[PDB]
Design a protein around this ligand. Structure first.
Ligand SMILES: *[C@@H]1O[C@H](CO)[C@@H](O[C@@H]2O[C@H](CO)[C@@H](O)[C@H](O)[C@H]2NC(C)=O)[C@H](O)[C@H]1NC(C)=O
Ligand SMILES: *[C@@H]1O[C@H](CO)[C@@H](O[C@@H]2O[C@H](CO)[C@@H](O)[C@H](O)[C@H]2NC(C)=O)[C@H](O)[C@H]1NC(C)=O
Ligand SMILES: *[C@@H]1O[C@H](CO)[C@@H](O[C@@H]2O[C@H](CO)[C@@H](O)[C@H](O)[C@H]2NC(C)=O)[C@H](O)[C@H]1NC(C)=O
Ligand code: NAG
Ligand code: NAG
Lengths: 49, 206
């Protein structure tokens, strides 16, 4: 389980290859479910699967 | 004088990474092949529901912008000045002069905000009490005409600052620039495998 800035969810927080632009905070699936997230402390990008 | 927008003026409508997907967004965009005003002077231009602004310079001729309902100390006015060293963003009841050549203002009062940090391209939005800047600087073959082809502006600055804007101006040092107005349009945006917007359909165009 996780909570990122109030984004509750569950998954395996794989280290992402996705090339987030510096303004982007979250990634979304084709459904509106959250597909990736920036860590609010390290500001790395994680996949959520 | 006027010119076509030539499919420029797309920007990322969300702070959301999207990739390998086509996304529809109803948002304030410069329409494809819209009728942009052209300049070389710096009038008290209308701002409407938002502006695409672009300029081509080789010697840093433009030095920023100012915005408000009056551009007078009766109301708060937003200023962005790019001085010789810094980008300075201020919100005050400024007393501006007749031309903001660089002597932009005599004084400032009742201040509420500050922020500090080729073809140049910008989009300005002022919606629901935010003000947002998107931009790109684009290398191009010539110094004085707006190009063909497509690229999407990245978000630059983003301010929770609550001003009311109907007028704006261009600041100048002691060059060709273009102004286009955003419309509420549905755009189908192509986000590629790197999640950059590479192309768009203006669903209203034809
Ligand atoms: C351009 O604007 C910046 C404001 O962002 C000016 O910065 C100030 O400079 C003085 C010294 O001249 C410092 O004491 C202040 O602390 C600076 N303020 C900030 C907010 O950084 C800068 O001086 C301007 N450039 C020129 C050449 O005048
Ligand atoms: C700053 O803005 C305020 C409004 O938010 C102005 O307030 C008026 O100030 C005068 C002098 O103090 C009062 O007589 C009025 O009653 C105030 N208006 C209200 C609605 O309270 C103020 O004038 C502005 N600053 C300057 C220098 O003009
Ligand atoms: C996705 O991003 C990479 C950069 O990480 C792009 O690859 C670069 O492309 C330019 C093209 O001029 C080359 O000069 C660089 O050497 C490339 N860098 C790497 C690391 O390969 C890639 O083209 C992008 N793909 C798409 C479809 O936009
Ligand atoms: C917040 O924490 C991370 C480590 O989790 C650290 O790298 C970062 O520098 C911290 N941010 C600030 C502003 O101190
Ligand atoms: C562009 O707009 C002006 C009015 O602002 C109009 O006079 C002119 O004919 C328009 N041009 C085109 C090609 O629509």
């Amino acid at each position: 389980n996780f909570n990122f800035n109030g984004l509750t969810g569950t998954g395996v927080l794989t280290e992402s290859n996705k090339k987030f632009l510096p303004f982007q905070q979250f990634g979304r699936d084709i459904a509106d479910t959250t597909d990736a997230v920036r860590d609010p402390q390290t500001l790395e990008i994680l996949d959520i699967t | 004088a006027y010119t076509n927008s030539f499919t420029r003026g797309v920007y990322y409508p969300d702070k959301v990474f999207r990739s390998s997907v086509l996304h529809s967004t109803q948002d304030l965009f410069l329409p494809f092949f819209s009728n942009v005003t052209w300049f070389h002077d710096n009038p008290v231009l209308p701002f409407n529901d938002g502006v695409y602004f672009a300029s081509i310079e080789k010697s840093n001729i433009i030095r920023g912008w100012i915005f408000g309902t009056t551009l007078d100390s009766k109301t708060q006015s937003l200023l962005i000045v790019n001085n010789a060293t810094n980008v300075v963003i201020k919100v005050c009841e400024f007393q501006f002069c007749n031309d903001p050549f660089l002597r932009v203002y005599s004084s400032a009062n009742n201040c509420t905000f500050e922020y500090v940090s080729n073809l140049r391209e910008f989009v300005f939005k002022n919606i629901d009490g935010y003000f947002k800047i998107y931009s790109k600087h684009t290398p191009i073959n010539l110094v004085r005409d707006l190009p063909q082809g497509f690229s999407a502006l990245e978000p630059l600055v983003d301010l929770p600052i609550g001003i009311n804007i109907t007028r704006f101006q261009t600041l100048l040092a002691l060059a060709a620039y273009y102004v286009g107005y955003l419309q509420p349009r549905t755009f189908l945006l192509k986000y590629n495998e790197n999640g950059t917007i590479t192309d768009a359909v203006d669903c209203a165009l034809d």
